Amino acid sequence: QVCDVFDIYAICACCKVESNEVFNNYTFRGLGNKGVLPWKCISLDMKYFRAVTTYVNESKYEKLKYKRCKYLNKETVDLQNVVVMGRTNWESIPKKFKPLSNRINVILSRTLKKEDFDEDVYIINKVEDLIVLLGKLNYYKCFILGGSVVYQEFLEKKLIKKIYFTRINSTYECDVFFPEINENEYQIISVSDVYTSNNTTLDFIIYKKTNDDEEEDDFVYFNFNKENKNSIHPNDFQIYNSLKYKYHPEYQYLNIIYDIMMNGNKQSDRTGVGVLSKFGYIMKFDLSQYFPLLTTKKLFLRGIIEELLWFIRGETNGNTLLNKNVRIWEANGTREFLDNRKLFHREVNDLGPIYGFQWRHFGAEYTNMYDNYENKGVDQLKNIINLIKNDPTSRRILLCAWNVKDLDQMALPPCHILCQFYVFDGKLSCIMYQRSCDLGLGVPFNIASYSIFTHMIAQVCNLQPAQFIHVLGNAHVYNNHIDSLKIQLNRIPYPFPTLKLNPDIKNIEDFTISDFTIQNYVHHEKISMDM
């Protein structure tokens, strides 16, 4: 209750530490090294630090000072925030910075005296002397800045109301570590957008201690005709519904799953499996700040990169993929699947004029997967690259795989109908339109595929990737993914990884598997969607 009275919070920034790894909240625990911060400088976290440790709402202080006085059984107290540091933490701060501007500076030490310090720079000897000092002060909120020992003992005494935790998604050498937060005591309630600052991704999470209104009526009136549809239970998404602010871009995906589960229409499909379906969604991912590889389950990327490279080569030979143990297309190339497609005269694993053929040879007559198609058909891929380089404000930079004439000769019609690209201020955005979206299994791979593809096109055009924009047409959750996706919805995302391409690759056809590196992929446990 003390932490509720005096509004005592922790704020920290933790990196990953040098040692299939297992990831959990304690993965981010690196506080310092050699008396200083483990990283060189992360200025977005510092901006966030100053905004949090200095923000004050005077219009809410009267209620706070009222509550503090009543608790002390006083009527008067005898506007800034309080910041509390350990002595080691106070020493490491450069002299130019000290004392922390517009903050009431409090050092918890056992070898200091106010006689070496200011009148306004307070020193306390034990933790309980802060509760005394706060009772005598006028302050909005009290922030505990560390370090490790200060965090440890404040936390063990349940003196912390909330933990403002920056997750630094890179690994450094550390010799002091944030204490493990007991998830029975504290639970994550808000997660921020993902950012890039100083060559690392980071995000901001909030741990919580566990336990004109004239126009507000008009809101109810305009809701008078509202319906909450399906046999999914609210109590199953407890963690998901308990979160207040879900700004992490992975919630763009997770919110669509929840929407389809709650409001999807029950329908059959070819496999008789049954789906919940909705029609029409857009997701947007900021490739300049992160690589949107889902973190609430484990995803593998080798297969889909090879598939992309196989596309760019113009290949339609499934064997090429199968010999690399990339089996994305195997079921679509069997004798039985082709026969059921009425492709009686198609060789096994000859998928016909699918993506690769349309990207490099749209309009050419397909014969078989071994034929030579050099200079036959429209080379869309080359054309869009040249439009991007030479006519970047063109509204006609489209790459289309839905060749209406060839659909029946394909093993199956493409789910990814087209990409359209957009260039502004030397930056490349790409929209992909998908007609059919397996949310549980297919869509997570599809976001990665076209996010990688957007990086590749941008690099060979000497542009920076900006946004990948994903338009979902028939968007469905297979009934046999529902249990698994319920598990997934209650996992809290980690800060996204980043993608690195070999910078020397300046032509779209020159990438190989080794030119792609995923960095700092922190993820929850893998999940079998069909359990």
Where along the sequence are the contacts to ligand NDP (CB under 6 A)?
12-13, 31-32, 35-37, 86-89, 92, 108-112, 125-127, 145-150, 153, 176
For residue 17, give both structure tokens: 């530490």
Quick one: which segment of 70-78, 93-101, 123-131, 352-360 binds ligand U8I (CB under 6 A)? 93-101
* Residue 13 assigned to a binding site: yes
Do residues 145 and 89 touch, judged by C-beta distance below 8 A? yes
Do residues 444 and 299 touch, judged by C-beta distance below 8 A? yes
Distance (Å, whole) CA 521 – CA 20: 12
Q: Tell me if residue 255 falls in helix, strand or coil.
A: helix
**Which of positions 280-299 make contact with a second copy (CB under 8 A)?**
280-282, 284
With respect to ligand NDP, which residue has the nearer C-beta, 39 or 258?
39
442 binds, among a second copy, ligand UMP, ligand NDP, none (CB under 5 to 8 A by kind): ligand UMP
Do residues 33 and 176 touch, judged by C-beta distance below 8 A? yes
Q: Does 13 bind ligand U8I (CB under 6 A)?
A: yes
Our measurement of the distance from residue 491's CA atom to the centroid of its chain's CA atoms, rounded to an integer in Å, reads 12
Pairing status of strand 416-424 against strand 398-400: antiparallel
E strand intervals along 133-199: 139-144, 162-172, 176-177, 186-191, 195-197
With respect to ligand U8I, which residue has the nearer C-beta, 40 or 226?
40
Alpha-carbon radius of gyration of the chain: 28
For residue 93, give both structure tokens: 């701060």
Least distance from ligand U8I to the Cβ atom of residue 32, Å = 9
Quick one: which segment of 60-68, 92-100, 224-232, 378-386 binds ligand U8I (CB under 6 A)? 92-100
Binding ligand U8I by CB under 6 A: which of 49, 178, 251, 453? 49
Least distance from a second copy to the Cβ atom of residue 440, Å = 15
Q: Does 142 bind a second copy (CB under 8 A)?
A: no
Do residues 415 and 355 touch, judged by C-beta distance below 8 A? no
Binding ligand UMP by CB under 6 A: which of 52, 407, 412, 417? 412
* Residue 147 assigned to a binding site: yes
Least distance from a second copy to the Cβ atom of residue 302, Å = 28
Bridge partners of residue 476, in order along the sequence: 277, 438
Quick one: which segment of 129-137, 206-214, 432-440, 517-525 binds ligand UMP (CB under 6 A)? 432-440
For residue 164, give both structure tokens: 């403002």
Binding ligand U8I by CB under 6 A: which of 97, 221, 222, 224? 97
Report DSSP state, residue 490: T
Q: Does 438 bind ligand UMP (CB under 6 A)?
A: yes
- Cis link prior to 392 (omega < 30° from 0)? no
Least distance from ligand U8I to the Cβ atom of residue 221, Å = 11
Q: Does 469 bind a second copy (CB under 8 A)?
A: yes
Distance (Å, whole) CA 193 – CA 392: 30
Bridge partners of residue 196, in order along the sequence: 201
Do residues 530 and 481 touch, judged by C-beta distance below 8 A? yes
* Residue 438 assigned to a binding site: yes
Pairing status of strand 176-177 against strand 30-32: antiparallel
* Residue 102 assigned to a binding site: no
Least distance from ligand NDP to the Cβ atom of residue 270, Å = 52
For residue 512, give both structure tokens: 């190989």
**Which of positions 380-399 make contact with ligand UMP (CB under 6 A)?**
395-396
Binning the chain into helix, strand and coil, the percentages to the nearest 5 are: 35, 25, 40
Do residues 3 and 160 touch, judged by C-beta distance below 8 A? yes
Do residues 324 and 306 touch, judged by C-beta distance below 8 A? yes
Give the active site residues.
415
Bridge partners of residue 37, in order along the sequence: none
With respect to a second copy, which residue has the nearer C-beta, 115 or 425?
425
Q: Does 220 bind a second copy (CB under 8 A)?
A: yes
**Which of positions 302-321 make contact with a second copy (CB under 8 A)?**
none
With respect to ligand UMP, which residue has the nearer C-beta, 328 or 508?
328
* Residue 89 assigned to a binding site: yes
Question: How many CB atoms within 10 Å of residue 35?
Answer: 11
- Positions at the binding site: 13, 31, 33, 35-36, 87-89, 109-111, 126, 147-150, 153, 270, 395-396, 415-416, 434-436, 438, 446, 476, 478
- Positions at the binding site for NADPH: 13, 31, 33, 35-36, 87-89, 109-111, 126, 147-150, 153
Q: Rule CB under 6 A: which residues touch ligand U8I? A: 11-13, 36-37, 45, 49, 92-94, 97, 145-146, 166
Q: Rule CB under 6 A: which residues touch ligand UMP? A: 270, 395-396, 412-413, 415, 436-438, 442-443, 446
